[PDB]
Amino acid sequence: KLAVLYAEHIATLQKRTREIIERENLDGVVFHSGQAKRQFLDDMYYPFKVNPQFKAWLPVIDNPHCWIVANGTDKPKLIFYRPVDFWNEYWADYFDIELLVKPDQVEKLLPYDKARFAYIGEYLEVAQALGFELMNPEPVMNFYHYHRAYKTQYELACMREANKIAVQGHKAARDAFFQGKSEFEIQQAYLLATQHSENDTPFGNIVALNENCAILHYTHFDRVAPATHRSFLIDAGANFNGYAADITRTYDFTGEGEFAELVATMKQHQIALCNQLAPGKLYGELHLDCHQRVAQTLSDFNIVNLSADEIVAKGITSTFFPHGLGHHIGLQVHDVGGFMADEQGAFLRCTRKIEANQVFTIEPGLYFIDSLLGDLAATDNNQHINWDKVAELKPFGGIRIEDNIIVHEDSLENMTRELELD
Amino acid sequence: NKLAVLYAEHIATLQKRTREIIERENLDGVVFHSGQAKRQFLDDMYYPFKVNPQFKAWLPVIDNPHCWIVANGTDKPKLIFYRPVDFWHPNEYWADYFDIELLVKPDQVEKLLPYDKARFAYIGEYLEVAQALGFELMNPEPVMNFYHYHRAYKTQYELACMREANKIAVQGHKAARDAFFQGKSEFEIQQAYLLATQHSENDTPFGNIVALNENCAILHYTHFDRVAPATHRSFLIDAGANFNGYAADITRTYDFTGEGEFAELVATMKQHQIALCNQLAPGKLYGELHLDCHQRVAQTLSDFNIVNLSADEIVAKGITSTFFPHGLGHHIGLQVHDVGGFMADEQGAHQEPPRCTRKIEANQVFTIEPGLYFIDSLLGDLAATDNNQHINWDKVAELKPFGGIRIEDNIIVHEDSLENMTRELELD
Ligand SMILES: CC(C)NP(=O)(O)NC(C)C
Ligand SMILES: CC(C)NP(=O)(O)NC(C)C
Ligand SMILES: [Ba+2]
Ligand SMILES: [Ba+2]
Ligand SMILES: [Ba+2]
Ligand SMILES: [Mn+2]
Ligand SMILES: [Mn+2]
Ligand SMILES: [Mn+2]
Ligand SMILES: [Mn+2]
Ligand SMILES: [Mn+2]
Ligand SMILES: [Mn+2]
Ligand SMILES: [Mn+2]
């Protein structure tokens, strides 16, 4: 039951609010869910995306014009938008709820003296019209983002659920790929098994076949299946109550050959890497180990004619693994706080020290990218590359294997692999 | 006939329109900004991109931010085409109608624009960006009004594009209707539709309305139930399709068993709808058809004995608006609810109502969407007035579980004939 954990979640957020509003001499904090954005010269709207700082309090992620007023001592106030034009859950009990019928009528529900209420939201003009003066003050943002990195038990439960949903999608997509479906059909299967509409996914799914696996930010879906099937890379997640999953699997169509061997080797490394998560360990250290294991893979597979250490030393591994090893995840897919050393807020996304109750992705990759390979060929590192072998693996695109892992004090919970996603 | 051939005449037409408006407004030229990607608050995700309708009026490029068209109508239009270069990430028929220049980063655009921007109209959303570039004429009304007025007269290219949008949507509607009769859920029916049209959700020109039972009475229903209802009674689906920036906008209503009072109601509305389609004609005000719809809705109410009055009495007492609360339809094209539908002249003067009021002409494209609904709120208001006595509330109660009815086609008006794109593609 989520309701039991949720009670503790509110209590934690109230505690956090109490601390920062005392420290920064405020009366309260006002969290603005957001608004509907209208398309230029049109009467159509973009899909609504809630303020992360709003939904941090409660699973209301599809409602604009909502407001939260909290001071950490009284019950948080919730202004809940609810129009009446002809066109009650467990969390409700924890707020004093006021219903709003028209957004411009919010002004009589907010504090008369807004001088010392920090407005937390996107809409600065609306805030100033209402009478707010302090908007998104850095000390306050920094403080919340720092503590967003420690997930309450409520949040962990939500994140286990989002993972479980995503893992059903990933399996359906995997099966669809082995049946030789198009990227577009694979995506439909993924949406169907997760019961997600496209604007429900926490990010735009990456569903790639063959050469497209090397396109790191690939977003399209081919409606036409490839003449031959070689490789498949799916990076997709899911939402539960505002919390995200973010999972990548890569597959060889045949299960035999050098690329299939490459994939399984990357998988052992990625599991090894996961298991190095531990309290009191700088995340950056794992990112260094990943370049080393990637160096060793390139050497072992005779993609590069050097020892693993020499590949690292000559700066060759960045050509094949050009992004960070991972990141915090939670309410945002690339979650906040991943750079902060303290509450004050003093390439690689996470450098912060690992601790209990933090949640991570571990996503080593190995790609054969056109422009990066062209750069290397121009350097003195030309002599060392096995160009014949790059040509061989090129048609398969690349590889990424990505899990979501919760760190505990004396254990790790790899959510994705504990769900038996191979 | 083929799109490539028709497009040549489309460009020539846009050039001619540009020449007249810049000459009249004393401009040097017009600049269409496709738009930009919008970042989510405190995040590094983006909203889905939506192109400036005035930009895609020129060419079928709808997924590309940071593009600019510089037109004056005499020289070939200059296209500034965004094409970034990084490891993370133009040869079709329309390309050689533009003087094209590639832009590898958005902040490098100042170079490619006119050095003196004083008499160039900026047509776009990003006012402050455009000001910083030096533009000072932001979306000038005389120019907006003028382009939006002529948007009502589709070129042959645009007509062909809209026939393809309609073709694709009709596929979706057939898959959806089949899915309905198999007792599927709203969410599974929407999936069938997206499959048949090969559209991602953000490709549809609007958010699909896929409603079962009482949900059919929620005009702006947007959710997709994951759970099939225990009893299937009714289905209403309002859904379109994009082709090259042009929209289709189709609605069908179905009864599950195809027998009974609600099923006969659908059949009756269908016949009214078809009769209203054939009322489109050059010279007629679209208002004249809107009033006929109300007459016909009043006639349905009278015949089915939902209201105990003659059709004419029902209209006089203003009762039909309880059951048909919206407009008969609207222009359609680049925008779903297309521009120019209220304008009486190029100066943007308002044709007064008795949405769309403008005098109908050849080459314009309309929706026709009569509907009849049983809406709690509106029936509640009806129960408060001195028209209480005239309503059969028992029959209303029996029909309420079916939600409502809408039937919507996209029709082209020709000088001598009408072209119902939707019924031509065999969607009954
Ligand atoms: C959310 C996902 C699609 N992006 P990522 O954080 O897994 N970055 C990858 C491209 C390395
Ligand atoms: C475009 C669609 C979603 N709505 P509509 O203009 O076809 N009809 C109205 C009455 C809902
Ligand atoms: Ba070997
Ligand atoms: Ba070997
Ligand atoms: Ba060593
Ligand atoms: Mn105080
Ligand atoms: Mn005070
Ligand atoms: Mn990912
Ligand atoms: Mn990730
Ligand atoms: Mn001609
Ligand atoms: Mn419609
Ligand atoms: Mn319509």
Swiss-Prot record, chain B:
Mn(2+) 2 binds at D238, D249, E408. Keywords: Detoxification, Dipeptidase, Hydrolase, Manganese, Metal-binding, Metalloprotease, Protease. GO terms for biological process: proteolysis; response to toxic substance. Optimum pH is 8.5 with DFP as substrate. One of its GO terms (molecular function) is aminopeptidase activity. Binds 2 manganese ions per monomer. Its EC number is 3.4.13.9, 3.8.2.2, 3.1.8.1. Optimum temperature is 50 degrees Celsius. Can be used for the catalytic detoxification of some nerve agents neurotoxins. One of its GO terms (cellular component) is cytosol. Mn(2+) 1 binds at D249, H330, E369, E408. Its cofactor is Mn(2+). The keyword Ribonucleoprotein does not apply. Belongs to the peptidase M24B family. Bacterial-type prolidase subfamily. Monomer. Splits dipeptides with a prolyl or hydroxyprolyl residue in the C-terminal position and a nonpolar amino acid at the N-terminal position. Also catalyzes the hydrolysis of toxic organophosphorus cholinesterase-inhibiting compounds including insecticide paraoxon and nerve gases such as diisopropylfluorophosphate (DFP), O-isopropyl methylphosphonofluoridate (sarin), O-pinacolyl methylphosphonofluoridate (soman), and O-cyclohexyl methylphosphonofluoridate. Has a stereoselective preference for isomers with R-configuration at the phosphorous center of sarin and soman, and with S-configuration in phosphotriesters. This is Xaa-Pro dipeptidase.
